[PDB]
From a paper:
Prochlorperazine displayed improved activity compared to trifluoperazine, differing by replacement of the 2-trifluoromethyl-substituent with a chlorine, with an IC50app of 39.9 ± 7.0 and IC50 49.5 ± 24.9 μM in the FP- and UPLC-based assays, respectively. Clear electron density in the active site of Tet(X4) is observed for the tricyclic phenothiazine group in both the trifluoperazine and prochlorperazine complexes, including their 2-trifluoromethyl- and 2-chloro-substituents, respectively. The phenothiazine rings adopt near identical conformations (ESI Fig. S25†), suggesting a conserved binding mode. Analysis of the binding mode using Protein–Ligand Interaction Profiler (PLIP)63 reveals the phenothiazine groups make conserved hydrophobic contacts with residues Asn190, Gln192, Phe224 and Phe319. In the prochlorperazine complex and equivalent conformation with trifluoperazine, the protonated quaternary amine of the 4-methyl-piperazine group is proximal to Asp61 and Glu114 near the active site entrance, allowing for formation of a charge–charge interaction. Perazines, with a 3-(4-methylpiperazin-1-yl)propyl group attached to their 10-phenothiazinyl amine, bound with greater affinity than their promazine counterparts, which possess a N,N-dimethylpropan-1-amine group at the same position. The three compounds bind to the active site in a manner overlapping with the tigecycline binding site, validating their proposed mechanism of action as non-covalent competitive inhibitors. With all three compounds, the FAD cofactor appears in the so-called FAD-IN position (ESI Fig. S24†), wherein the catalytically-important isoalloxazine FAD ring is directed toward the tetracycline binding pocket, rather than the FAD-OUT conformation, where the isoalloxazine is instead directed towards the putative NADPH binding site.
Numbering used by the authors: 12 to 382
The structure:
């Protein structure tokens, strides 16, 4: 085998890195995941994830976890509303499509993947800060923790990874849109009007360059996001301190001044907001060839892209499926060639996904956009 008497280090225990670990481990591969989170009870902020047939779901199938995912996921319909709260479109999930892409909470998905791994596969409180290639092994340097070695390093630590340079000099870029997100607990009580507007479905609305997305039931909480072109005054992210809810409430109430009070109530009752600039890690020219030791990247570390049209985790789970199969099917003469074959495929569907996400972004933020 390519990996017999060798070990693999996966950097990052996100959904992509944990899936990569499971697919390698179940073929007898010595693999560890180093995750910066202090422990597994760390809450993951964000909306739900939906896994697609042919990609995310195919990775779960290969891992024996497809039913586990279905049992914790929820098919959800979609309502499009206007800024006055009129429901313009209602699409519920037809029973024959209930397996197409049901939504799963991110902590639930992490728990599924962790539970499927052998004990002590993930090493918590391990923030990788530097890599160094040796004669045959990488040396991994962690923050204030002892070093580790690995024959193969797989960078899976998300879109802002700083440990990419052995693979590419490409830099993450801001696309020019900005996202504010929040959770409301017990929304049926705390934002009843907007909760009733959703009516069990996800909701999307667009008006004059401001977009609102909401999921009224991410394991009982309501998750929502407000997205817009990054204001020109923010060449230093000025005016809005996201540590100060009053500053954020004031900014959003002005942007949403002509929206229905059900939306304004949502802004008014939120206890804290998270701001996030939209970024892309653009796939263009090939990555570096003839690297000193085998190394590659998967998931957002490889092809972070805007999330507004549903691109994201599924292309990362496709990475893990392809790369793990190449490392274990015994068709390749070296780890480098298995990696090369993975990267060549990923550049094709990754570039397509990026082009679509970037085009979609352009369209959804034109001042007169409607869904
Ligand atoms: C607002 C918004 C909304 C959406 C989405 C994004 C955003 C910003 N996405 C995108 C999607 O969530 C994204 O593709 C995945 O989280 C990618 O998972 P990864 O495992 O690659 O990275 P992810 O960022 O999830 O995981 C990286 C892991 O590495 C760890 N880490 C970081 N640095 C480290 C270090 N130095 N050492 C060790 N560990 C380190 C982190 O703690 C984390 O656990 C999405 N996608 C989708 O498919 N459907 C959707 O609906 C959405 N919606
Ligand atoms: C099925 N999938 C579900 C959702 N995909 C869109 C993800 C958009 N995204 C979001 C975008 C920008 C800022 C914040 C957010 S937060 C959010 C919250 C709720 C919902 Cl439904 C969607 C989002 C697409 C397809």
């Amino acid at each position: 085998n390519l990996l017999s008497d060798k070990n693999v280090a996966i950097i990052g225990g996100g959904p992509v890195g944990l899936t990569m670990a499971k697919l390698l481990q179940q073929n007898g591969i010595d693999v560890s995941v180093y995750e910066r989170d202090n422990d597994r009870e760390a809450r993951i902020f964000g909306g739900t994830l939906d896994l697609h047939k042919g990609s995310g779901q195919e990775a779960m199938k290969k891992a024996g976890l497809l039913q586990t995912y279905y049992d914790l996921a929820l098919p959800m319909g979609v309502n499009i509303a206007d800024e006055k709260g009129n429901i313009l479109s209602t699409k519920n999930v037809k029973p024959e499509n209930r397996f197409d892409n049901p939504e799963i909470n991110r902590n639930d998905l992490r728990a599924i993947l962790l539970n499927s791994l052998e004990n002590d596969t993930v090493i918590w409180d391990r923030k990788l800060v530097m890599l160094e290639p040796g004669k045959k092994k990488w040396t991994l340097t962690f923050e204030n923790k002892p070093s580790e070695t690995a024959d193969l390093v797989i960078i899976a630590n998300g879109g802002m990874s700083k440990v990419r340079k052995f693979v590419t000099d490409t830099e993450v870029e801001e696309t020019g849109t900005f996202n504010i997100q929040a959770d409301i607990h017990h929304p049926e009580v705390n934002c009843p009007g907007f909760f009733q507007l959703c009516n069990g479905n996800r909701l999307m609305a667009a008006h004059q360059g401001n977009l609102l997305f909401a999921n009224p039931n991410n394991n009982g909480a309501l998750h929502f996001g407000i997205s817009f072109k990054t204001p020109d005054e923010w060449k230093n992210q000025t005016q809005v301190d996201f540590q100060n809810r009053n500053s954020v409430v004031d900014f959003l109430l002005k942007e949403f001044s002509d929206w229905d009070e059900r939306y304004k109530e949502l802004i008014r009752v939120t206890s804290s907001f998270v701001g996030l600039a939209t970024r892309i890690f653009p796939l263009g020219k090939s990555w570096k060839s003839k690297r000193p030791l085998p190394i590659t990247m998967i998931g957002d570390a490889a092809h972070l892209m805007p999330p507004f049209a549903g691109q994201g985790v599924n292309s990362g789970l496709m990475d893990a499926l392809i790369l793990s199969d190449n490392l274990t099917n015994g068709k390749f003469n070296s780890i480098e060639e298995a990696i090369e074959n993975y990267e060549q495929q990923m550049f094709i569907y990754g570039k397509e996904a990026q082009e679509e996400s970037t085009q979609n972004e352009i369209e959804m933020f034109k001042p007169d956009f409607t869904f």
